[PDB]
Amino acid sequence: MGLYRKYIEYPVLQKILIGLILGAIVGLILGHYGYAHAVHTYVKPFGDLFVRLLKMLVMPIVFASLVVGAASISPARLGRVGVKIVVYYLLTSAFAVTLGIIMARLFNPGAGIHLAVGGQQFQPHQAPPLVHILLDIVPTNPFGALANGQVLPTIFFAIILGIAITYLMNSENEKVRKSAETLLDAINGLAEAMYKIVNGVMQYAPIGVFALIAYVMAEQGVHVVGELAKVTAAVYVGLTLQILLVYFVLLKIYGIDPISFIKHAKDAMLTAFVTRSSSGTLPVTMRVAKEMGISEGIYSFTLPLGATINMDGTALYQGVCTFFIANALGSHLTVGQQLTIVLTAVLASIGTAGVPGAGAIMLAMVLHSVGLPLTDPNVAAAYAMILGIDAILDMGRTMVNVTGDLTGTAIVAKTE
Protein backbone atom coordinates (compact mmCIF):
# COMPACT_ATOMS: atom_id res chain seq x y z
CA MET A 1 0.00 0.00 0.00
CA GLY A 2 2.70 2.44 -1.04
CA LEU A 3 5.69 3.46 1.06
CA TYR A 4 4.19 1.51 3.99
CA ARG A 5 4.82 -1.80 2.22
CA LYS A 6 8.39 -0.68 1.51
CA TYR A 7 8.82 0.05 5.23
CA ILE A 8 7.30 -3.29 6.31
CA GLU A 9 9.69 -5.45 4.23
CA TYR A 10 12.72 -3.96 6.00
CA PRO A 11 14.10 -6.29 8.70
CA VAL A 12 12.85 -5.52 12.19
CA LEU A 13 16.21 -5.47 13.99
CA GLN A 14 17.72 -2.98 11.54
CA LYS A 15 14.95 -0.40 11.90
CA ILE A 16 14.76 -0.99 15.66
CA LEU A 17 18.48 -0.15 15.87
CA ILE A 18 17.97 2.81 13.52
CA GLY A 19 15.22 4.10 15.81
CA LEU A 20 17.47 3.50 18.84
CA ILE A 21 20.40 5.51 17.47
CA LEU A 22 18.23 8.24 15.92
CA GLY A 23 16.37 8.50 19.21
CA ALA A 24 19.51 8.78 21.32
CA ILE A 25 21.15 11.44 19.12
CA VAL A 26 17.98 13.51 18.65
CA GLY A 27 17.15 13.25 22.35
CA LEU A 28 20.62 14.39 23.43
CA ILE A 29 20.56 17.31 20.97
CA LEU A 30 17.06 18.45 21.93
CA GLY A 31 17.76 18.00 25.64
CA HIS A 32 20.90 20.10 25.52
CA TYR A 33 18.96 22.98 23.91
CA GLY A 34 16.24 23.01 26.57
CA TYR A 35 13.59 21.37 24.37
CA ALA A 36 12.75 18.57 26.81
CA HIS A 37 9.20 19.87 27.27
CA ALA A 38 8.54 19.83 23.52
CA VAL A 39 9.76 16.23 23.34
CA HIS A 40 7.62 15.29 26.37
CA THR A 41 4.59 16.92 24.72
CA TYR A 42 4.89 15.70 21.13
CA VAL A 43 7.34 12.80 20.75
CA LYS A 44 6.59 10.82 23.93
CA PRO A 45 2.95 9.71 23.14
CA PHE A 46 4.31 7.81 20.12
CA GLY A 47 6.23 5.63 22.60
CA ASP A 48 3.40 5.63 25.11
CA LEU A 49 1.30 3.99 22.39
CA PHE A 50 3.98 1.30 22.05
CA VAL A 51 3.99 0.59 25.80
CA ARG A 52 0.16 0.52 25.72
CA LEU A 53 0.17 -1.98 22.84
CA LEU A 54 2.69 -4.12 24.71
CA LYS A 55 0.75 -4.06 28.00
CA MET A 56 -2.46 -4.91 26.12
CA LEU A 57 -1.18 -8.40 25.34
CA VAL A 58 0.22 -9.37 28.75
CA MET A 59 -2.74 -11.04 30.47
CA PRO A 60 -4.04 -13.17 27.52
CA ILE A 61 -0.44 -14.22 26.76
CA VAL A 62 0.23 -15.26 30.36
CA PHE A 63 -3.06 -16.99 31.17
CA ALA A 64 -3.76 -18.69 27.85
CA SER A 65 -0.16 -19.78 27.36
CA LEU A 66 0.18 -21.16 30.89
CA VAL A 67 -3.09 -23.11 30.74
CA VAL A 68 -1.76 -24.80 27.59
CA GLY A 69 1.66 -24.83 29.30
CA ALA A 70 0.38 -27.50 31.67
CA ALA A 71 1.06 -30.02 28.92
CA SER A 72 3.97 -31.50 30.86
CA ILE A 73 3.31 -33.99 33.66
CA SER A 74 1.75 -32.23 36.62
CA PRO A 75 3.78 -33.14 39.78
CA ALA A 76 7.16 -34.17 38.45
CA ARG A 77 8.23 -31.89 35.61
CA LEU A 78 6.50 -28.74 36.85
CA GLY A 79 7.83 -29.15 40.38
CA ARG A 80 11.30 -29.89 39.01
CA VAL A 81 11.36 -26.78 36.82
CA GLY A 82 9.89 -24.70 39.65
CA VAL A 83 12.69 -25.71 42.02
CA LYS A 84 15.31 -25.47 39.24
CA ILE A 85 14.18 -21.96 38.35
CA VAL A 86 13.83 -20.71 41.95
CA VAL A 87 17.39 -21.81 42.77
CA TYR A 88 18.63 -20.04 39.62
CA TYR A 89 16.61 -16.91 40.44
CA LEU A 90 18.08 -16.66 43.93
CA LEU A 91 21.67 -17.49 42.98
CA THR A 92 21.93 -15.07 40.04
CA SER A 93 20.51 -12.20 42.11
CA ALA A 94 22.86 -13.03 45.00
CA PHE A 95 25.75 -12.87 42.54
CA ALA A 96 24.38 -9.68 40.95
CA VAL A 97 24.39 -7.77 44.25
CA THR A 98 27.95 -8.98 44.91
CA LEU A 99 29.05 -7.84 41.45
CA GLY A 100 27.44 -4.49 42.21
CA ILE A 101 29.45 -4.26 45.44
CA ILE A 102 32.62 -5.16 43.50
CA MET A 103 31.92 -2.52 40.84
CA ALA A 104 31.08 0.06 43.53
CA ARG A 105 34.40 -0.70 45.22
CA LEU A 106 36.30 -0.50 41.93
CA PHE A 107 34.74 2.83 41.07
CA ASN A 108 34.10 5.30 43.90
CA PRO A 109 30.64 6.82 43.35
CA GLY A 110 30.13 9.82 45.59
CA ALA A 111 33.88 10.25 46.13
CA GLY A 112 33.62 12.81 48.90
CA ILE A 113 30.85 15.03 47.56
CA HIS A 114 28.94 17.50 49.71
CA LEU A 115 25.51 18.70 48.71
CA ALA A 116 22.72 20.95 49.92
CA VAL A 117 19.64 19.78 51.82
CA GLY A 118 16.47 21.17 50.27
CA GLY A 119 14.83 18.12 48.77
CA GLN A 120 11.74 16.50 50.21
CA GLN A 121 12.17 13.79 52.85
CA PHE A 122 10.26 11.26 50.81
CA GLN A 123 8.83 8.30 52.78
CA PRO A 124 9.92 6.06 55.67
CA HIS A 125 9.62 2.59 54.15
CA GLN A 126 7.36 -0.02 55.74
CA ALA A 127 6.87 -3.47 54.24
CA PRO A 128 3.57 -5.36 54.08
CA PRO A 129 3.57 -8.10 56.73
CA LEU A 130 4.58 -10.89 54.26
CA VAL A 131 1.71 -13.19 55.16
CA HIS A 132 -0.58 -10.97 53.07
CA ILE A 133 2.06 -10.97 50.30
CA LEU A 134 2.07 -14.77 50.26
CA LEU A 135 -1.68 -15.17 50.79
CA ASP A 136 -2.44 -12.80 47.89
CA ILE A 137 -0.90 -15.30 45.46
CA VAL A 138 -4.04 -17.42 45.82
CA PRO A 139 -6.75 -15.22 44.24
CA THR A 140 -10.19 -14.88 45.78
CA ASN A 141 -11.58 -14.29 42.28
CA PRO A 142 -9.87 -15.57 39.10
CA PHE A 143 -11.70 -13.17 36.78
CA GLY A 144 -10.90 -10.31 39.15
CA ALA A 145 -7.25 -11.34 39.04
CA LEU A 146 -7.47 -11.41 35.24
CA ALA A 147 -9.07 -7.95 35.13
CA ASN A 148 -6.99 -6.20 37.82
CA GLY A 149 -3.51 -6.76 36.41
CA GLN A 150 -2.13 -9.30 38.91
CA VAL A 151 0.16 -11.59 36.92
CA LEU A 152 1.16 -13.59 40.00
CA PRO A 153 -2.34 -14.85 40.97
CA THR A 154 -2.98 -15.52 37.28
CA ILE A 155 0.06 -17.83 37.23
CA PHE A 156 -1.37 -19.85 40.13
CA PHE A 157 -4.87 -20.09 38.67
CA ALA A 158 -3.57 -20.98 35.20
CA ILE A 159 -1.36 -23.76 36.61
CA ILE A 160 -4.30 -25.13 38.62
CA LEU A 161 -6.69 -24.93 35.64
CA GLY A 162 -4.24 -26.60 33.26
CA ILE A 163 -3.51 -29.43 35.70
CA ALA A 164 -7.27 -29.93 36.14
CA ILE A 165 -7.75 -29.92 32.35
CA THR A 166 -5.07 -32.56 31.81
CA TYR A 167 -6.70 -34.65 34.54
CA LEU A 168 -10.04 -34.26 32.75
CA MET A 169 -8.55 -35.34 29.41
CA ASN A 170 -7.50 -38.69 30.93
CA SER A 171 -11.00 -39.40 32.24
CA GLU A 172 -13.10 -42.43 31.38
CA ASN A 173 -16.15 -40.36 30.44
CA GLU A 174 -16.32 -39.19 26.83
CA LYS A 175 -18.32 -35.97 27.23
CA VAL A 176 -15.94 -34.62 29.90
CA ARG A 177 -12.92 -35.45 27.74
CA LYS A 178 -14.43 -33.75 24.69
CA SER A 179 -15.35 -30.69 26.77
CA ALA A 180 -11.83 -30.48 28.21
CA GLU A 181 -10.16 -30.76 24.81
CA THR A 182 -12.53 -28.14 23.35
CA LEU A 183 -11.69 -25.74 26.19
CA LEU A 184 -7.97 -26.42 25.68
CA ASP A 185 -8.32 -25.85 21.92
CA ALA A 186 -10.05 -22.50 22.49
CA ILE A 187 -7.43 -21.38 25.01
CA ASN A 188 -4.62 -22.44 22.66
CA GLY A 189 -6.26 -20.48 19.85
CA LEU A 190 -6.32 -17.39 22.08
CA ALA A 191 -2.62 -17.93 22.87
CA GLU A 192 -1.65 -18.27 19.19
CA ALA A 193 -3.69 -15.17 18.34
CA MET A 194 -1.79 -13.19 20.98
CA TYR A 195 1.53 -14.46 19.60
CA LYS A 196 0.44 -13.16 16.19
CA ILE A 197 -0.44 -9.73 17.63
CA VAL A 198 3.09 -9.63 19.14
CA ASN A 199 4.43 -9.81 15.57
CA GLY A 200 1.86 -7.15 14.71
CA VAL A 201 3.12 -4.64 17.27
CA MET A 202 6.80 -5.36 16.64
CA GLN A 203 6.43 -3.50 13.32
CA TYR A 204 5.27 -0.39 15.16
CA ALA A 205 8.15 -1.03 17.60
CA PRO A 206 10.81 1.18 15.83
CA ILE A 207 8.68 4.31 16.28
CA GLY A 208 8.20 3.34 19.92
CA VAL A 209 11.94 2.78 20.44
CA PHE A 210 12.69 6.18 18.87
CA ALA A 211 10.01 8.03 20.83
CA LEU A 212 10.91 6.36 24.14
CA ILE A 213 14.69 6.68 24.10
CA ALA A 214 14.45 10.22 22.67
CA TYR A 215 12.28 11.28 25.61
CA VAL A 216 14.58 9.54 28.10
CA MET A 217 17.73 11.15 26.68
CA ALA A 218 15.98 14.53 26.39
CA GLU A 219 14.86 14.64 30.01
CA GLN A 220 17.67 12.88 31.86
CA GLY A 221 20.59 12.44 29.45
CA VAL A 222 22.05 15.86 30.22
CA HIS A 223 22.03 15.29 34.00
CA VAL A 224 24.70 12.56 33.68
CA VAL A 225 27.55 14.83 34.79
CA GLY A 226 30.16 14.66 37.51
CA GLU A 227 29.86 11.77 39.95
CA LEU A 228 26.54 10.84 38.35
CA ALA A 229 28.65 9.83 35.34
CA LYS A 230 30.74 7.71 37.72
CA VAL A 231 27.69 5.96 39.18
CA THR A 232 26.25 5.50 35.67
CA ALA A 233 29.51 3.91 34.52
CA ALA A 234 29.65 1.78 37.68
CA VAL A 235 26.11 0.58 36.99
CA TYR A 236 26.49 -0.07 33.26
CA VAL A 237 29.92 -1.75 33.49
CA GLY A 238 28.46 -3.90 36.26
CA LEU A 239 25.51 -4.84 34.05
CA THR A 240 27.87 -5.67 31.18
CA LEU A 241 29.85 -7.92 33.52
CA GLN A 242 26.59 -9.39 34.87
CA ILE A 243 25.84 -10.47 31.32
CA LEU A 244 29.31 -11.58 30.21
CA LEU A 245 30.69 -13.23 33.38
CA VAL A 246 27.46 -14.85 34.59
CA TYR A 247 25.01 -15.51 31.77
CA PHE A 248 27.58 -16.37 29.09
CA VAL A 249 29.43 -18.71 31.45
CA LEU A 250 26.21 -20.39 32.58
CA LEU A 251 25.13 -20.78 28.95
CA LYS A 252 28.53 -22.19 27.98
CA ILE A 253 28.69 -24.78 30.78
CA TYR A 254 25.20 -26.03 29.86
CA GLY A 255 25.96 -26.47 26.15
CA ILE A 256 24.15 -23.42 24.75
CA ASP A 257 25.90 -21.08 22.32
CA PRO A 258 25.71 -17.59 23.88
CA ILE A 259 26.09 -15.71 20.58
CA SER A 260 23.14 -17.63 19.12
CA PHE A 261 21.29 -16.90 22.37
CA ILE A 262 21.84 -13.15 21.92
CA LYS A 263 20.83 -13.51 18.26
CA HIS A 264 17.56 -15.05 19.42
CA ALA A 265 16.97 -12.68 22.35
CA LYS A 266 17.87 -9.34 20.73
CA ASP A 267 14.18 -8.59 20.13
CA ALA A 268 13.49 -8.93 23.86
CA MET A 269 16.63 -7.14 25.07
CA LEU A 270 16.25 -4.09 22.81
CA THR A 271 12.57 -3.84 23.75
CA ALA A 272 13.25 -4.06 27.50
CA PHE A 273 15.99 -1.44 27.09
CA VAL A 274 13.56 1.27 25.95
CA THR A 275 10.25 0.24 27.50
CA ARG A 276 11.90 -0.07 30.97
CA SER A 277 9.16 -2.56 31.92
CA SER A 278 9.95 -6.21 32.63
CA SER A 279 6.20 -6.90 32.74
CA GLY A 280 5.47 -5.10 29.46
CA THR A 281 8.27 -6.88 27.61
CA LEU A 282 6.74 -10.20 28.71
CA PRO A 283 4.88 -10.94 25.41
CA VAL A 284 8.06 -10.26 23.42
CA THR A 285 10.06 -12.40 25.87
CA MET A 286 7.58 -15.27 25.55
CA ARG A 287 7.69 -14.92 21.75
CA VAL A 288 11.50 -15.07 21.85
CA ALA A 289 11.43 -18.22 24.00
CA LYS A 290 8.80 -19.69 21.67
CA GLU A 291 10.98 -19.06 18.61
CA MET A 292 14.12 -20.72 20.00
CA GLY A 293 12.52 -24.15 20.41
CA ILE A 294 11.86 -24.12 24.16
CA SER A 295 8.81 -26.22 25.02
CA GLU A 296 5.76 -24.44 26.40
CA GLY A 297 5.76 -26.07 29.83
CA ILE A 298 9.12 -24.54 30.66
CA TYR A 299 8.88 -20.99 29.33
CA SER A 300 5.16 -20.34 29.97
CA PHE A 301 5.82 -20.84 33.70
CA THR A 302 9.37 -19.51 34.07
CA LEU A 303 8.96 -16.22 32.18
CA PRO A 304 5.89 -14.66 33.93
CA LEU A 305 7.45 -15.82 37.19
CA GLY A 306 10.78 -14.26 36.22
CA ALA A 307 9.18 -10.97 35.19
CA THR A 308 8.72 -10.09 38.88
CA ILE A 309 10.96 -12.44 40.87
CA ASN A 310 14.22 -12.50 38.89
CA MET A 311 15.55 -8.94 38.76
CA ASP A 312 19.34 -9.10 38.55
CA GLY A 313 19.75 -5.59 37.19
CA THR A 314 17.58 -4.06 39.91
CA ALA A 315 19.65 -6.02 42.42
CA LEU A 316 22.92 -4.68 40.98
CA TYR A 317 21.49 -1.14 40.88
CA GLN A 318 20.47 -1.35 44.55
CA GLY A 319 23.91 -2.75 45.34
CA VAL A 320 25.67 0.16 43.65
CA CYS A 321 23.49 3.06 44.82
CA THR A 322 23.65 1.96 48.46
CA PHE A 323 27.44 2.30 48.29
CA PHE A 324 26.95 5.63 46.50
CA ILE A 325 24.75 6.99 49.30
CA ALA A 326 27.02 5.60 52.02
CA ASN A 327 30.01 7.22 50.32
CA ALA A 328 28.20 10.55 49.98
CA LEU A 329 27.42 10.30 53.71
CA GLY A 330 30.94 9.22 54.68
CA SER A 331 30.04 5.88 56.25
CA HIS A 332 32.58 3.08 56.57
CA LEU A 333 29.95 0.39 55.79
CA THR A 334 31.78 -2.72 57.01
CA VAL A 335 31.50 -6.24 55.60
CA GLY A 336 28.84 -7.17 58.16
CA GLN A 337 26.76 -4.44 56.54
CA GLN A 338 27.71 -5.53 53.02
CA LEU A 339 26.42 -9.04 53.73
CA THR A 340 23.14 -7.47 54.85
CA ILE A 341 23.22 -5.47 51.60
CA VAL A 342 23.54 -8.79 49.73
CA LEU A 343 20.70 -10.32 51.77
CA THR A 344 18.37 -7.30 51.55
CA ALA A 345 18.87 -6.29 47.91
CA VAL A 346 17.84 -9.80 46.86
CA LEU A 347 14.54 -9.40 48.72
CA ALA A 348 14.17 -5.86 47.38
CA SER A 349 14.66 -7.08 43.81
CA ILE A 350 12.17 -9.90 44.39
CA GLY A 351 9.69 -7.38 45.78
CA THR A 352 10.30 -4.82 43.04
CA ALA A 353 7.42 -4.60 40.58
CA GLY A 354 8.02 -4.66 36.84
CA VAL A 355 6.87 -1.08 36.20
CA PRO A 356 9.50 1.55 35.28
CA GLY A 357 10.97 3.35 38.28
CA ALA A 358 10.15 0.80 40.99
CA GLY A 359 13.78 -0.01 41.81
CA ALA A 360 14.41 3.48 43.13
CA ILE A 361 11.28 3.13 45.28
CA MET A 362 12.37 -0.26 46.64
CA LEU A 363 15.89 1.09 47.27
CA ALA A 364 14.54 2.52 50.56
CA MET A 365 14.41 -0.98 52.08
CA VAL A 366 18.09 -1.74 51.46
CA LEU A 367 18.87 1.79 52.63
CA HIS A 368 16.97 1.22 55.90
CA SER A 369 18.61 -2.19 56.42
CA VAL A 370 22.15 -0.91 56.96
CA GLY A 371 21.43 2.12 59.13
CA LEU A 372 20.96 4.81 56.48
CA PRO A 373 17.34 5.90 57.09
CA LEU A 374 15.60 7.89 54.38
CA THR A 375 13.98 10.21 56.92
CA ASP A 376 17.05 12.38 57.57
CA PRO A 377 17.75 15.16 55.02
CA ASN A 378 21.39 14.27 54.32
CA VAL A 379 20.47 10.86 52.89
CA ALA A 380 17.39 12.05 50.97
CA ALA A 381 19.52 14.76 49.33
CA ALA A 382 21.89 12.12 47.94
CA TYR A 383 18.93 9.89 47.02
CA ALA A 384 17.40 12.67 44.91
CA MET A 385 20.62 12.63 42.86
CA ILE A 386 19.96 8.96 42.04
CA LEU A 387 16.34 9.81 41.22
CA GLY A 388 17.70 12.38 38.77
CA ILE A 389 19.11 9.64 36.50
CA ASP A 390 16.85 6.75 37.57
CA ALA A 391 15.59 6.39 33.98
CA ILE A 392 19.12 6.19 32.54
CA LEU A 393 19.97 3.43 35.01
CA ASP A 394 16.56 1.78 34.51
CA MET A 395 17.11 1.39 30.75
CA GLY A 396 20.03 -0.97 31.33
CA ARG A 397 18.79 -2.71 34.44
CA THR A 398 15.51 -3.71 32.75
CA MET A 399 17.40 -5.30 29.84
CA VAL A 400 19.48 -7.31 32.31
CA ASN A 401 16.27 -8.21 34.21
CA VAL A 402 14.79 -9.74 31.06
CA THR A 403 18.04 -11.41 29.91
CA GLY A 404 18.21 -13.18 33.28
CA ASP A 405 14.75 -14.70 32.76
CA LEU A 406 15.64 -15.83 29.24
CA THR A 407 18.94 -17.35 30.37
CA GLY A 408 17.25 -19.24 33.21
CA THR A 409 14.53 -20.53 30.88
CA ALA A 410 17.09 -21.75 28.32
CA ILE A 411 19.25 -23.37 31.02
CA VAL A 412 16.33 -25.22 32.63
CA ALA A 413 15.03 -26.29 29.20
CA LYS A 414 18.48 -27.69 28.43
CA THR A 415 18.44 -29.45 31.82
CA GLU A 416 15.30 -31.43 30.93
Ligand X SMILES: CCCCCCCC/C=C\CCCCCCCC(=O)O[C@H](COC(=O)CCCCCCCCCCCCCCC)COP(=O)(O)OCCN
Ligand Y SMILES: N[C@@H](CC(=O)O)C(=O)O
Give the footprint of ligand X on this chain (CB under 6 A).
3-4, 7, 53, 86, 127-128, 133-134, 196-197, 199-201, 203-204, 207, 308-309, 347, 350-351
Dihedral sign for Cα atoms in the order 176, 179, 181, 184: negative
Least distance to ligand X, CB of residue 405, Å? 14
Neighbours of 189 (CB within 10 A): 12
**Of the candidates 104, 305, 311, 392, which one interacts with ligand Y according to CB under 6 A?**
311
Residue 86 interface partner, choices ligand X, ligand Y, none, CB cut-off 5-8 Å depending on type? ligand X
Q: Is 108 helix (H, G, I), strand (E, B) or coil?
A: coil
Neighbours of 60 (CB within 10 A): 17
* Residue (314 or 322) nearer to ligand Y, CB: 314
* Residue (221 or 356) nearer to ligand Y, CB: 356
Q: Draw the binding track, 266-305, toward ligand Y (x: CB under 6 A; -: no contact).
A: ----------xxx---------------------------
Least distance to ligand X, CB of residue 316, Å? 17
* Residue (106 or 127) nearer to ligand X, CB: 127
**Of the candidates 398, 403, 407, 409, which one interacts with ligand Y according to CB under 6 A?**
398
Residue 10 interface partner, choices ligand Y, ligand X, none, CB cut-off 5-8 Å depending on type? none
Q: Using H for helix, E for strand and C for coil, what is the string for 332-373?
A: CCCHHHHHHHHHHHHHHHHHCCCCCCHHHHHHHHHHHHHCCC
What whole-number distance in Å separates Cα of residue 270 and Cα of residue 286?
14
What whole-number distance in Å separates Cα of residue 199 and Cα of residue 272?
16
* Residue (279 or 407) nearer to ligand X, CB: 279
Looking at residue 374, the DSSP 8-state letter turns out to be S
What whole-number distance in Å separates Cα of residue 54 and Cα of residue 202?
9
* Residue (68 or 399) nearer to ligand Y, CB: 399
What whole-number distance in Å separates Cα of residue 49 and Cα of residue 44?
9
Residue 81 interface partner, choices ligand Y, ligand X, none, CB cut-off 5-8 Å depending on type? none
Residue 127 interface partner, choices ligand Y, ligand X, none, CB cut-off 5-8 Å depending on type? ligand X
Nearest to 356 by CA among 288, 414, 281: 281
Residue 226 interface partner, choices ligand X, ligand Y, none, CB cut-off 5-8 Å depending on type? none
Half-sphere exposure of 156 (CA within 13 A, CB side): 14
Within 8 A by CB and 6+ apart from 4, the residues are none
Four-point Cα dihedral 97, 98, 104, 107, nearest 10:
-130
Residue 23 interface partner, choices ligand X, ligand Y, none, CB cut-off 5-8 Å depending on type? none
Residue 397 interface partner, choices ligand X, ligand Y, none, CB cut-off 5-8 Å depending on type? ligand Y
Residue 243 interface partner, choices ligand Y, ligand X, none, CB cut-off 5-8 Å depending on type? none
Amino acid occupying residue 42:
Y
Q: Quick check: 220 binds ligand Y (CB under 6 A)? A: no
Q: How far is CA 314 from CA 55, 92, 236, 358, in A?
A: 21, 12, 12, 9
Nearest to 70 by CA among 203, 222, 218, 183: 183
* Residue (1 or 116) nearer to ligand X, CB: 1
Residue 7 interface partner, choices ligand X, ligand Y, none, CB cut-off 5-8 Å depending on type? ligand X
Least distance to ligand Y, CB of residue 166, Å? 32
Least distance to ligand X, CB of residue 200, Å? 2
Q: Where are the alpha helices (DSSP H) in 11-75?
A: 12-32, 36-38, 45-56, 58-68
**Of the candidates 401, 403, 407, 409, which one interacts with ligand Y according to CB under 6 A?**
401
* Residue (5 or 114) nearer to ligand X, CB: 5
What whole-number distance in Å separates Cα of residue 85 and Cα of residue 77?
12
Neighbours of 339 (CB within 10 A): 12
* Residue (31 or 354) nearer to ligand Y, CB: 354
* Residue (91 or 241) nearer to ligand X, CB: 91
Looking at residue 130, the DSSP 8-state letter turns out to be S
Q: Draw the binding track, 345-384, toward ligand Y (x: CB under 6 A; -: no contact).
A: -------x-x-xxxx-------------------------
Amino acid occupying residue 156:
F
State the residues that interact with ligand Y by CB under 6 A. Answer: 276-278, 311, 314, 352, 354, 356-359, 394, 397-398, 401
